[PDB]
């Protein structure tokens, strides 16, 4: 019946002091970690934080919990997890995390006959990653996640990976839910961090991300290119029809201003100069120089119209060349990276 198992369990938990770790005077306790990412949440640039959903697994050998019985593997309820020792593992750069409590605490405890405890939780981890938005929107940056033990020096608790490290952090295929970015790969590393208190082992995991460009292709680049081409087209019309060309030059600059407002809305405030801002500044400068040329032509038509016609023809044959040259230079420079 169940009385056998209850007696086994009560004899087991008897005298087990949870304040102490396993093997105090003896060798260091070694904990083995594993991470299975169910879904990679939305990455927010405005807060510079990424949400992740993980199945955190840990395993450690403990001498006191060994027993002799017929079952040979005990799958125990979640509420027993608080009585035995459990290593504390706080993510070094987690802004705010939450352990789900849907219908019962999401914890599983598995005790083998030898004494190899397995203990896993489910977590939603919201971690910060600094970014270099200089190459925006052609940027590619890696968001890290570093977890290590607390209140325990390296002399007492050492973290290791359960399998070959390359296959430790495992990500689900359809789990990735990224609206804008794209996932490339995952990398792991072990390290030692030295502080005022002591040395602490730290596991680091980098997730590499890259940004899709298709949105910003039609978002801002195409409007500015169309506006440059339109504002340049006005140079072919006759200089006698003044009001049409004036309305042309005014509408171009107004559309450019609205586009610049949207582009500034696009990204959070930074001291850097983004590449999109560079492109938009050059586009605006070109349309404004074209408007200035039209204005000086309209002012100059009275003094000497022959020089005005020469200026018009020269501007026609000169502007698209410089525009296309700059566009080629810029696109090559930021695509080669």
């Amino acid at each position, epitope marked *: 019946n169940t009385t056998v198992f209850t007696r086994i369990l009560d004899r087991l938990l008897d005298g087990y002091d949870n304040r102490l770790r396993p093997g105090l005077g003896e060798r260091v306790t070694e904990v083995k970690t594993d991470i299975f990412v169910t879904s990679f949440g939305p990455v927010s640039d405005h807060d510079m934080e990424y949400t992740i959903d993980v199945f955190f697994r840990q395993s450690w050998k403990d001498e006191r919990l060994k027993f002799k019985g017929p079952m040979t593997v005990l799958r125990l309820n979640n509420l027993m997890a608080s009585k035995i020792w459990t290593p504390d593992t706080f993510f070094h750069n987690g802004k705010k995390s939450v352990a789900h409590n849907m219908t019962m605490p999401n914890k599983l405890l598995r005790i083998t006959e030898d004494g*190899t405890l397995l203990y896993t939780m489910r977590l939603t981890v919201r971690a910060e990653c600094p970014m270099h938005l200089e190459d925006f929107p052609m940027d590619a940056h890696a968001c890290p996640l570093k977890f290590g033990s607390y209140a325990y020096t390296r002399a007492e608790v050492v973290y290791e990976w359960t399998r*070959e*490290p*390359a296959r430790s952090v495992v990500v689900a295929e359809d789990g990735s839910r990224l609206n804008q970015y794209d996932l490339l790969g995952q*990398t792991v590393d*072990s390290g030692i961090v030295q502080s005022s208190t002591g040395e602490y082992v730290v596991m680091t995991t980098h997730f590499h991300l890259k940004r899709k460009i298709g949105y910003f292709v039609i978002q801002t680049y195409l409007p500015c290119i169309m506006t440059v081409i339109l504002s340049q087209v006005s140079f072919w019309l006759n200089r006698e029809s003044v009001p049409a060309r004036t309305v042309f030059g005014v509408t171009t600059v107004l559309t450019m201003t609205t586009l610049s407002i949207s582009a500034r809305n696009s990204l959070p405030k930074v001291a850097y100069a983004t590449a999109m801002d560079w492109f938009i500044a050059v586009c605006y400068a070109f349309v404004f120089s074209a408007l200035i040329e039209f204005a000086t032509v309209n002012y100059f038509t009275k003094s000497q119209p022959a020089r005005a016609a020469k200026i018009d023809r020269l501007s026609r044959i000169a502007f698209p060349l410089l525009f296309g040259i700059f566009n080629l230079v810029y696109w090559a420079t930021y695509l080669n990276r």
Partner: antibody
Amino acid sequence: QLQQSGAELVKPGASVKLSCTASGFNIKDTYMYWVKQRPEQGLEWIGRIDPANGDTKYDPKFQGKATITTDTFSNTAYLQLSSLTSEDTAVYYCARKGLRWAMDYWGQGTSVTVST
Amino acid sequence: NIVMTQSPKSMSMSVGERVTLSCKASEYVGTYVSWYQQKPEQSPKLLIYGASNRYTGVPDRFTGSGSATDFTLTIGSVQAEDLADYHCGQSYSYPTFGAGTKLELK
């Protein structure tokens, strides 16, 4: 700390079984690797075994020519080769994982010779 | 599969000279390269596990420097018996080994 069988000479085309006996620990905690070394050449990886689940991984080029099986009661690992030619005449070592995934402890080694 | 390139092939330096051996990794391996020493007709031993960490019972003359893809083993005052084969093997993935380096007295 680790024990292995003595030198073994076998005719080509006949399988042979090599043994690696641990002493002073239980292998149910750590993995067990097998490495081969030809005379005056670089080391090469044969495969590793995890005694907890019995799962094994092999180098694809050596896949299908060697099988690794463990016994926890005797606390021993066994490497059974397939039909081996005169080419693979070399030394063999069994190793245990270390602190940072370094094969620290090695057996004295055994020499597998093939002759007609 | 990850491949390791070890340099130089072989070298001959006298007692008391600083010696440097380099290990190059094709793919990424992060601070998991180890350095093993093997004397003739003996099983290999472990010298450096991880990067810049010395296994217990190894003299302080051996040092190691690591990175993402470059690794260096450095010896200062080199004794008479320290000449032996050195192997840099990575275990970030299914472990592999370099060609090896044989060091001989001049």
